[PDB]
Write a protein that binds this ligand. Structure first.
Ligand SMILES: CCCCCCCCCCCCCCCCCC(=O)OC[C@H](COP(=O)([O-])OCC(O)COP(=O)([O-])OC[C@@H](COC(=O)CCCCCCCCCCCCCCCCC)OC(=O)CCCCCCCCCCCCCCCCC)OC(=O)CCCCCCCCCCCCCCCCC
Ligand SMILES: CC(C)=CCC/C(C)=C/CC/C(C)=C\CC/C(C)=C/CC/C(C)=C/CC/C(C)=C/CC/C(C)=C/CC/C(C)=C/CC/C(C)=C/CC1=C(C)C(=O)c2ccccc2C1=O
Ligand SMILES: CC(C)=CCC/C(C)=C/CC/C(C)=C\CC/C(C)=C/CC/C(C)=C/CC/C(C)=C/CC/C(C)=C/CC/C(C)=C/CC/C(C)=C/CC1=C(C)C(=O)c2ccccc2C1=O
Ligand SMILES: CC(C)=CCC/C(C)=C/CC/C(C)=C\CC/C(C)=C/CC/C(C)=C/CC/C(C)=C/CC/C(C)=C/CC/C(C)=C/CC/C(C)=C/CC1=C(C)C(=O)c2ccccc2C1=O
Ligand SMILES: CC(C)=CCC/C(C)=C/CC/C(C)=C\CC/C(C)=C/CC/C(C)=C/CC/C(C)=C/CC/C(C)=C/CC/C(C)=C/CC/C(C)=C/CC1=C(C)C(=O)c2ccccc2C1=O
Ligand SMILES: CC(C)=CCC/C(C)=C\CC/C(C)=C\CC/C(C)=C/CC/C(C)=C/CC/C(C)=C\CC/C(C)=C/CC/C(C)=C\CC/C(C)=C/CC1=C(C)C(=O)c2ccccc2C1=O
Ligand SMILES: CCCCCCCCCCCCCCCC(=O)O[C@H](COC(=O)CCCCCCC[C@@H](C)CCCCCCCCC)COP(=O)(O)O[C@H]1[C@H](O)[C@H](O)[C@H](O)[C@@H](O)[C@@H]1O
Ligand SMILES: CCCCCCCCCCCCCCCC(=O)O[C@H](COC(=O)CCCCCCC[C@@H](C)CCCCCCCCC)COP(=O)(O)O[C@H]1[C@H](O)[C@H](O)[C@H](O)[C@@H](O)[C@@H]1O
Ligand code: HEC
Ligand code: HEC
Ligand code: HEM
Lengths: 55, 110, 107, 223, 53
């Protein structure tokens, strides 16, 4: 569990600082990220998903 | 996360010894049978702690879901091509995580 | 180098050191079985398990206690082990029952 | 009226002689001799329905019985009159016995079952597969006398447990353990068949993962 | 055989002390496993020991 926790921390850090990938679409380029900001929306969706999985 | 929480709960009742004892418990079809101390501790979790069977069943189901979700995530990463130039090392870390999860689940249910 | 050797040096054991006493000296664990004689001519019976613990967990057998289509598991007895009354004989018997090369099928 | 096996040797002659012979001699093509066998073998083979058998192959399966109205007794007495095989247990009324053979001890019965019986059937008496066709059936619908006569007569490819290597208490205790293991609840929810992790993995993949992926499809947009 | 033996009043002088335990002869000496368990549970009880002066 300790090794797994360290590796998961490193994994999520690398995903956080190398921004996420995306699918080609209308306004998507290799130089921008199109989505929603964390602030109101993304934390909300993540927490609701957590609660549903626990359920 | 759920695995961590339920395992921390479970560690308060488990005794990992291999010495032999006679059961003398509440489960009648096993009374008088000679068993190790770990097996007796697991039986005591199952039958003599209010809500222990529920917790160990959650633990096992969460282990199964952990493994299945890891495999589906790997399938996504592979098929969409999200492992290319900037992210090979993140792929490597994921592979190590997969191996460790397999062996951890094995050691757990043994 | 010295530190790592001292760290991983307490776990290493020799699998071939003679520790098991037999009739030709002492052998390695991986070649003795519990069916191995100890003093050159000892009698080892084919005892069977009864599943009860009043006195017998193991009893001798006769050739007539079986028909032409039967099978039975047997264990080495060594009458010097006795029934499971005292703690000494109880330890001997519980070590007979748990040996990974002891069981035998009688056809 | 025990001096009447004229019935008996009225049904055998019209349902068995094509595969065992008129004198119970074992037609050298299909059937065994049936001389050393007794009333217990006939009872177990007919009451469970494995008898009179069609084509006959690696395992005769269990079917619906053809004979009752005390004619299983007729064939059993007729076959016992031509040999010295084992006999069926009886109660003080003359009928075939039951709940008094429930080895009041389930620990010893379960240990004996795990040592002698669980290898082919299961931990709790579900089925098991043998080589090249043959299998070991489920122990749920068999009553007590059928269990006793089964482990006493040693049917096809099942070993024969005499009354000298498995005494009568041992048999009664095994019967009691089997009948209790087939009739107890599952105190953890719906058991997925009695087997190990294969139904559990299937239920995971086909319930939990579809629920999770369906909620992921609902919450997140698709593009 | 004995981890516990009875006592007589003459087995002590005017300046002696001794620890004692409850016996209950139905416990017997420590030969079988049953009596051995009974005795090992007598020996470990936090209110059993007594000083005899
Ligand atoms: C362990 C177990 C943990 C469990 C797992 C969960 C943790 C995973 C992390 C997920 C989210 C990470 C969040 C985050 O990074 O925010 C950092 C964020 C830094 O933001 P930043 O300035 O943009 O990043 C620095 C550079 O600008 C960056 O600029 P850059 O674009 O040039 O990036 C260069 C980058 C390039 O290098 C990399 O990409 C590799 C990074 C891997 C590092 C190993 O190098 C770095 O900066 C790496 C930063 C490492 C810090 C975070 C790593 C910690 C996790 C490590 C786990 C073990 C390993 O720090 C914050 O301030 C967050 C706000 C919270 C503070 C509130 C304080 C309130 C008052 C306190 C009250 C006192 C009581
Ligand atoms: C005892 C025995 C019987 C069982 C014990 C088993 C054990 C696993 C109990 C689990 C309890 C566990 C903590 C349930 C979670 C409850 C949830 C998270 C409540 C919140 C859901 C929702 C209604 C509130 C909105 C959530 C938002 C607004 C804040 C919370 C929030 C959370 C919770 C995040 O995990 C998160 C992760 C990443 C980014 C952001 C967030 C975030 O904003
Ligand atoms: C088993 C056996 C018999 C004993 C069991 C117990 C035993 C194994 C104890 C552990 C032994 C082990 C930990 C030895 C450690 C010795 C290390 C520190 C040798 C390095 C010393 C060396 C001369 C100094 C040069 C290294 C410096 C320049 C860089 C490394 C470095 C280090 C090491 C920091 O701790 C550090 C902390 C905070 C900021 C930066 C640094 C940093 O740059
Ligand atoms: C595979 C083999 C060949 C079995 C197939 C049966 C065979 C005799 C005929 C199939 C006919 C075929 C050749 C033509 C095409 C048929 C058509 C494509 C549809 C049929 C496909 C079948 C039915 C899908 C299932 C096949 C099988 C391999 C799936 C295994 C699933 C595992 C074993 C589940 C395990 C499992 C078990 C064993 C339970 O007892 C149980 C009890 C209670 C709850 C859950 C379970 C549970 O999940
Ligand atoms: C995609 C990836 C595997 C490519 C890797 C690239 C490759 C070149 C690297 C080398 C790998 C080597 C050479 C060979 C790999 C083969 C094997 C030895 C690998 C070991 C571990 C491996 C890497 C894990 C990957 C397995 C794979 C990704 C599983 C994903 C399956 C898919 C995507 C699920 C989608 C949704 C799903 C179908 C919902 C419906 C449910 C169905 C029925 C799931 C089927 C199903 C499954 C999958 C069970 O595991 C299972 C287990 C026990 C009982 C039943 C089931 C069962 O029914
Ligand atoms: C301060 C205090 C502890 C001192 C104690 C004082 C002392 C005297 C008392 C002693 C008492 C001791 C013995 C015990 C005290 C504590 C004890 C009771 C704890 C034992 C176990 C206990 C029951 C645990 C309870 C806590 C529990 C209810 C809360 C769990 C909820 C938490 C852990 C959820 C966090 C989730 C996770 C770790 C955060 C990761 C960051 C988030 C999720 C972003 C993740 C994320 C990232 C990073 C992406 O890049 C990304 C990219 C694209 C899509 C998605 C994502 C995405 O989701
Ligand atoms: C991989 C195989 C390589 C093995 C190389 C070592 C060869 C020689 C060899 O292994 O023989 C033992 C000696 O061990 C050692 O020093 C081995 C240390 C080398 C560490 C290797 C680092 C990599 C002594 O026999 P033994 O009596 O069984 O061990 C007792 C004693 O270790 C000691 O009391 C204690 O460790 C006991 O646990 C015990 O079992
Ligand atoms: C030179 C080293 C290079 C060779 C590669 C290492 C291979 C492992 C060498 C190895 O362990 O092989 C045994 C040998 O044992 C030994 O004492 C050899 C001495 C230990 C050498 C390794 C220790 C490393 C230290 C010195 C550092 C075989 O004898 P044994 O294990 O007793 O099994 C049976 C009985 O001998 C039986 O009497 C006989 O009848 C045979 O059936 C069979 O040989
Ligand atoms: C040829 C078709 C066939 C018919 C019809 C038939 N049997 Fe059988 N019987 C067999 C075969 C084949 C076996 C061998 C057992 C096996 O392999 O399952 C057998 C076995 C038996 C056995 C057990 C033999 C043993 O050694 O334990 C008995 C008892 C028996 N039969 C009696 C009967 C009775 C009663 C009837 C109903 C009148 C009947 N048979 C009709 C083919 C037949
Ligand atoms: C794998 C070897 C094997 C062993 C060991 C074994 N069985 Fe069987 N058992 C079988 C086979 C094969 C059959 C099917 C015989 C037939 O259909 O004629 C069977 C049939 C039975 C049946 C009939 C089931 C029914 O529904 O009619 C019972 C009851 C039974 N066995 C009980 C036992 C008991 C009790 C033991 C332990 C003493 C035991 N068996 C050990 C293989 C075995
Ligand atoms: C991280 C991945 C983990 C996996 C895949 C995993 C898997 C398992 C599984 C499948 C079992 C069997 C439970 C049962 O059958 O009843 C088990 C047992 C157990 N786990 Fe975990 N586990 C994990 C983490 C942990 C952690 C972090 C802890 C403690 C901090 C823990 C503590 C325990 C204990 C004590 C048992 C034995 C208790 C019992 O069997 O009832 N586990 N594990």
């Amino acid at each position: 569990p300790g090794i797994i926790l360290a590796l998961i921390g490193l994994h999520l850090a690398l995903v956080w600082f190398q921004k996420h990938t995306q699918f080609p679409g209308p306004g998507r380029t290799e130089h921008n990220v199109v989505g929603v900001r964390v602030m109101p929306v993304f934390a909300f969706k993540s927490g609701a998903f957590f609660a549903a999985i626990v359920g | 996360v759920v695995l961590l929480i339920t395992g921390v709960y479970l560690t308060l009742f488990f005794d990992p010894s291999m010495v032999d004892v006679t059961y003398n418990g509440v489960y009648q079809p096993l009374r008088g049978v000679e068993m190790s101390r770990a097996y007796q501790s697991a039986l005591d979790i199952s039958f003599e702690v209010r809500g222990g069977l529920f917790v160990r069943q959650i633990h096992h189901w969460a282990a199964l879901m952990f493994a299945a979700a890891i495999m589906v995530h790997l399938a996504r990463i592979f098929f969409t091509g999200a492992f290319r130039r900037p992210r090979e090392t993140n792929w490597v870390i994921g592979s190590l995580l997969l191996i460790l999860a397999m062996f951890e689940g094995y050691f757990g249910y043994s | 180098l010295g530190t790592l050797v001292a760290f991983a040096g307490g776990l290493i054991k020799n699998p071939w050191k003679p520790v098991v006493p037999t009739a030709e000296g002492k052998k390695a664990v991986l070649w003795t079985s519990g069916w191995t004689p100890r003093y050159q001519g000892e009698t080892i019976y084919l005892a069977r398990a009864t599943g009860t613990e009043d006195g017998p967990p193991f009893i001798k057998m006769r050739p007539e206690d079986m028909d032409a289509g039967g099978m039975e598991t047997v264990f080495p007895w060594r009458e010097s082990d006795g029934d499971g009354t005292t703690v000494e004989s109880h330890h001997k018997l519980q070590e007979i029952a748990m040996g990974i090369r002891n069981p035998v099928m009688l056809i | 009226s025990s001096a009447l096996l004229r019935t008996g040797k009225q049904l055998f002659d019209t349902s068995c002689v094509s595969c065992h012979g008129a004198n119970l001699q074992g037609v050298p093509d299909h059937g065994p001799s049936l001389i050393g066998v007794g009333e217990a073998a006939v009872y177990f083979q007919v009451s469970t329905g494995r008898m009179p058998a069609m084509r006959g192959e690696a395992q005769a399966p269990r079917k619906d019985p053809i004979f009752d109205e005390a004619q299983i007794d007729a064939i059993g007495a007729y076959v016992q009159a031509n040999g010295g095989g084992p006999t069926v247990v009886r109660n003080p009324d003359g009928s075939i016995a039951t709940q008094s053979l429930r080895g009041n001890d389930l620990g010893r019965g379960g240990d004996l079952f795990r040592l002698n019986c669980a290898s082919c059937h299961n931990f709790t008496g579900k089925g098991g597969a043998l080589s090249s066709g043959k299998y070991a059936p489920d122990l749920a619908p068999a009553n007590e006398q059928q269990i006793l006569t089964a482990m006493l007569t040693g049917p096809q490819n099942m070993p024969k447990f005499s009354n000298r290597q498995l005494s009568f208490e041992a048999k009664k205790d095994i019967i009691a353990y089997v009948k209790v293991a087939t009739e107890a609840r599952q105190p953890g929810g719906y058991l997925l068949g009695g087997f190990g992790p294969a139904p559990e993995g299937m239920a995971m993949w086909i319930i939990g993962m579809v629920a999770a992926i369906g909620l992921a499809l609902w919450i997140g947009a698709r593009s």
